Design a protein around this ligand. Sequence first.
Ligand SMILES: *[C@@H]1O[C@H](CO)[C@@H](O)[C@H](O)[C@H]1NC(C)=O
Lengths: 49, 50, 40, 49
Amino acid sequence: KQLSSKFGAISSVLNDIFSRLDPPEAEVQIDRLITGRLQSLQTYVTQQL
Amino acid sequence: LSFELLHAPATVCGPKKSTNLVKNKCVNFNFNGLKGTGVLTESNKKFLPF
Amino acid sequence: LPQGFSALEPLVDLPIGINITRFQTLLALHRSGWTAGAAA
Amino acid sequence: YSVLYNLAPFFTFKCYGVSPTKLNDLCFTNVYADSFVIRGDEVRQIAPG
Ligand SMILES: *[C@@H]1O[C@H](CO)[C@@H](O)[C@H](O)[C@H]1NC(C)=O
């Protein structure tokens, strides 16, 4: 569900962003998406260990 | 002009290119101008008309 | 109203794009002055 | 995308938003084409934000 979450972005799908948003733009959007996913997975890894 | 998507399916699309429905290879695919993963196989689940 | 569950699928979508604030329902009078059947 | 362009001499096609090179891979459900005329340097006024 956290992977499906948008994390306050335009969309939760990277491919739609790449096919719609400007290739020079959306770098901050994909960076915030990947760092939100990184925070979620690091919380998962910590609770798993 | 505004280029936005709604709940209805996109009746007008920019890409015309070369229409084909060929298969039996395995490299990578594109659908509706959106990249993704998966192999287009048979669907036993019948869809609603909408 | 009968007791039961019944979903309502979207039959059709109309892009009317106009303002709508009041709705009015019409009926009919059977001619055979006139006779009105049961309609709840 | 070829009948409204490359017919007349060059237009003032300076805008921010959808990429001109991304017009061949984008799908839109509906488009609202509105036409109007302005005077002089009012082109900058027709901009988002
Ligand atoms: C529709 O009409 C009502 C009453 O005249 C008004 O309050 C409302 O803002 C209108 N809506 C639109 C979208 O024009």
